[PDB]
């Protein structure tokens, strides 16, 4: 299965294999046990190159996994992959998409401390007043985690 190979190449960082497998008609949205696509895996690990390649081939930038309901944008926001966050948003990722816990990439970046990403998400048009299913806004999460710099930006 070329899709399973694409999934493994995506997290491995083998952008050569990614391009080749897609040239051979690999499923760009192939899903693994947790429902994650090669794009999810590339975004998770930080393989910007693979992320771009997959999107060029026609990866679903707004695909959500089947476990936590996170998009590649959610994953990049959490881990701190600023460069990938930018690309995904330019590709057309929904900046206010929520996961299964109702958290947006902004919720994640705010709670993680990724001020740089918070700023980008805000500039794109993220809703700083969006509550998650815990009743918290990204601002609230920034306050809870002592991220005053982020809190000031979100305020």
């Amino acid at each position: 299965d070329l899709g399973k190979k694409l999934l493994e190449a995506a997290r491995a960082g083998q952008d050569d294999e990614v391009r080749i497998l897609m040239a051979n008609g690999a499923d760009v949205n192939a899903a693994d046990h947790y429902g994650e696509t090669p794009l999810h895996r590339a975004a998770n690990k930080g393989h910007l190159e693979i992320v771009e390649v997959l999107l060029k081939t026609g990866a679903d930038v707004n695909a959500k996994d089947d476990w936590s309901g996170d998009t590649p944008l959610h994953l990049a926001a959490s881990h701190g992959h600023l460069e990938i966050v930018e690309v995904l948003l330019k590709a057309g990722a929904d900046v206010n998409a929520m996961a299964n816990d109702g958290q947006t990439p902004l919720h994640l970046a705010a709670s993680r401390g990724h001020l740089e990403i918070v700023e980008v998400l805000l500039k794109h048009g993220a809703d700083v007043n969006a509550q998650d299913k815990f009743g918290k806004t990204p601002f609230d999460l920034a306050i809870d985690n002592g991220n005053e710099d982020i809190a000031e930006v979100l305020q």
């Binding site: 947790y34 476990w67 936590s68 816990d101």
Partner: protein
């Protein structure tokens, strides 16, 4: 005796994981890797015997103290084994030995049997609160570890039996929740509310075995065996449930569980699996095709103890009802964690609630297993059927159908290696509703297929068509075999035709009452895919012999013949089983006669060899000659002569010699007892 994929290790197997077409056994001093397909060992990694020391600390190793001043060499029992796949694919394993301290084996990006090349121990040194030890996961004396991804963090929920070995700066917790660091080099407890611990005072009093844990519906559940109450003699199974959160253990509550025979209670849970039901079972227990049910194989306590006797019963709790029982508003307070006294407990996230009454359910086997100790259960659907995979202390493995309506008997039953069956089990499905269970026995793991089991076990035509539907068996003249491999056009799943080969007794007295014993095959009738003798009819000529079902089976029938008034010889016995009839042309209504007796007198001492003479004296079941109401013990029997020794009378007097043949009575000459 079956022949199955059979891997044997050199040390006992604690734990088992299936990942990317390989099998990882977590064993005493060892981790093995077998191939999913044939169970051949591909790789080992030696967690091997390890040296304990006060000075030798928990993630650093030592032959630099092997010479020892107060240090012991110790066996490394595997307590936990988790594959994690959110991060780069890794095996996480947690031994009993260095204060319960896990290591990660990171699979290289193609060789999956490589537990060996990149392995980091997980113990980050503790600096903020040097009192805590969050890298001390597992307890040497009993742990259950359940790992789940939540909020982008890998979370570990952990049950641990705990024993008051006051360990300075490395304590253990009874239940707890900690996450890995993204730096992969340490676990962390999120707040002081992230563990609940048995109070130091009761840490010994007596303990809490953790049998099973599982996540479902956004709670985490633990299954448990412990202390109906503290210092309170008798034991007990509970559920523990709490909200699935990093941040701490939140809506914590333990509620007792009761299995009963129908009160005959099975208070010691032995093993448990959680699965969806099939339609038949569904309908019966509260249903929902797509619902989680806790199948729990329980056992009866040796009085005043926690050790189990060889008495088992299994019964099933849908977690949907478990929750109802938890949610429905009566309610005690957590006696082992709080004081029995002080605040919170004299009051009513924050509170920790015990329940005072159990959720009870009845044995689904209804005693089918009340004389053996079930030690392992697993469960699957075949079409409408729900099937248990059972295991026993004697080593027996067996597949049963689960039902209220129907007291089903196992269609698979046999010996796995003499060592008991382990509660640690794996089920894995494959397309079209088959697959296999991996089943650990002492130090051997066996790959028992869920379905075929194979089809050539059944030896008679009746047993063959009684085989469970999923095996898809038919009868091919002389073998129970599937249709794709039948070499004559005689394969069938319907044609069970009856057959007699012996009938005793051969004859009955005219008065009847004689119970026949008809040996043969396939006398029953499979109604609604279940055999019984309800369709079975026994015709002796124009009258019928009434069957006794309690003493009858598929291969032998028992029935009382009625009375006749005429002698009849060479009469026909016809037996219909619904599909067909079979005959036996050899039965007779006699009429036994005593022509003479000799001698006609004897001593009061008895012991005279009395010869009765006549015809038909050897029908049917039993001969009983008597004199004076005292038994005339038989020496020899035949059609024509009955010899017996006369009983001792205490008076010299006369008696008629009475012969009793079933319901037939016969008197003959008087027998004088001379002095």
């Amino acid at each position: 005796k079956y022949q199955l994929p059979n891997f044997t290790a050199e040390t006992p197997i604690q734990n088992v994981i299936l990942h990317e077409h390989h099998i990882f056994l977590g064993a005493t001093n060892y981790i093995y890797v077998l191939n999913e397909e044939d169970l051949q060992k591909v790789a080992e990694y030696k967690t091997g015997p390890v040296l304990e020391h006060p000075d030798c600390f928990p993630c650093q190793d030592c032959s630099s103290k092997a010479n020892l001043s107060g240090g012991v060499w110790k066996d490394n029992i595997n307590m936990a084994l988790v594959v994690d796949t959110y991060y780069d694919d890794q095996l996480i394993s947690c031994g009993s030995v260095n204060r319960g301290t896990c290591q990660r084996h990171v699979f290289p990006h193609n060789h999956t049997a490589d537990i060996q090349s990149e392995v980091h121990c997980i113990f980050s040194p503790q600096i903020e609160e040097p009192s805590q030890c969050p890298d001390c996961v597992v307890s040497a004396l009993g742990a259950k570890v359940l790992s789940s991804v939540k909020d982008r963090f890998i979370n570990f929920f952990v049950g641990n039996t705990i024993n008051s070995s006051y360990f300075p700066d490395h304590p253990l917790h009874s239940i707890s929740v900690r996450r890995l660091k993204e730096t992969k080099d340490g676990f962390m407890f999120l707040t002081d509310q992230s563990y609940i611990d048995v109070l130091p005072e009761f840490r010994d009093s007596y303990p809490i075995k953790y049998v099973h844990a599982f996540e479902s519906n956004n709670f985490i559940y633990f299954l448990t065996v412990q202390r109906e109450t503290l210092d309170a003699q008798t034991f007990h199974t509970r559920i523990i449930r709490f909200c699935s959160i990093n941040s701490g253990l939140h809506s914590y509550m333990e509620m007792p569980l009761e299995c009963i025979l129908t009160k005959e209670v099975f208070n010691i849970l032995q093993a448990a699996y959680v699965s969806k039901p099939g339609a038949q079972l569904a309908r019966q227990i509260g249903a929902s095709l797509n619902d989680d049910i806790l199948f729990g194989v329980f056992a009866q306590s040796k009085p005043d103890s926690a050790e189990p006797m060889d008495r088992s019963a299994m019964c099933a709790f849908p977690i949907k009802y478990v929750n109802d029982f938890f949610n429905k508003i009566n309610v005690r307070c957590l006696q082992h964690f709080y004081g029995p006294n002080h605040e919170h407990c004299f009051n009513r996230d924050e509170y920790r609630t015990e329940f005072t009454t159990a959720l009870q359910r009845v044995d689904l086997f209804m005693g089918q297993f009340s004389e053996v100790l079930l030690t392992s259960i697993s469960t699957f659907i075949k079409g409408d059927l729900t099937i248990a995979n059972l295991g026993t202390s004697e080593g027996r493995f067996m597949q049963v159908v689960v039902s209220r309506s129907g007291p089903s008997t196992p269609h698979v039953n046999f010996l796995l290696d003499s060592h008991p069956v382990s509660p640690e089990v794996i089920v894995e499905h494959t397309l079209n509703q088959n697959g296999y269970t991996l089943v650990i026995t002492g130090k051997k793991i066996t790959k028992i297929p869920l379905n075929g089991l194979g089809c050539r076990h059944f030896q008679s035509c009746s047993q063959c068509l009684s085989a469970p539907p999923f095996v898809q068996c038919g009868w091919c003249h002389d073998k129970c075999v599937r249709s794709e491999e039948c070499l004559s056009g005689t394969w069938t799943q319907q044609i069970c035709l009856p057959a007699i080969y012996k009938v005793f007794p051969n004859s009955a007295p005219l008065e009847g009452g004689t119970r026949l014993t008809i040996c043969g095959w396939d006398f029953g009738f499979r109604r609604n895919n279940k055999f019984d003798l309800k369709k079975t009819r026994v015709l002796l000529g124009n009258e019928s012999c009434t069957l006794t079902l309690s003493e009858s089976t598929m291969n032998t029938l028992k029935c009382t013949v009625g009375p006749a008034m005429n002698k009849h010889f060479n009469m026909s016995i016809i037996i219909s089983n619904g599909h067909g009839t079979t005959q036996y042309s050899t039965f007779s209504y006699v009429d036994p006669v005593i022509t003479s007796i000799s001698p006609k007198y004897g001593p009061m001492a008895g012991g005279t060899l009395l010869t009765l003479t006549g015809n038909y004296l050897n029908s049917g079941n039993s001969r009983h000659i008597s004199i004076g109401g005292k038994t005339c013990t038989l020496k020899s029997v035949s059609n024509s002569i009955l010899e017996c020794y006369t009983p001792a009378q205490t008076i010299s007097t006369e008696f008629a010699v009475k012969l009793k043949i079933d319901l037939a009575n016969r008197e003959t000459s008087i027998f004088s007892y001379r002095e």
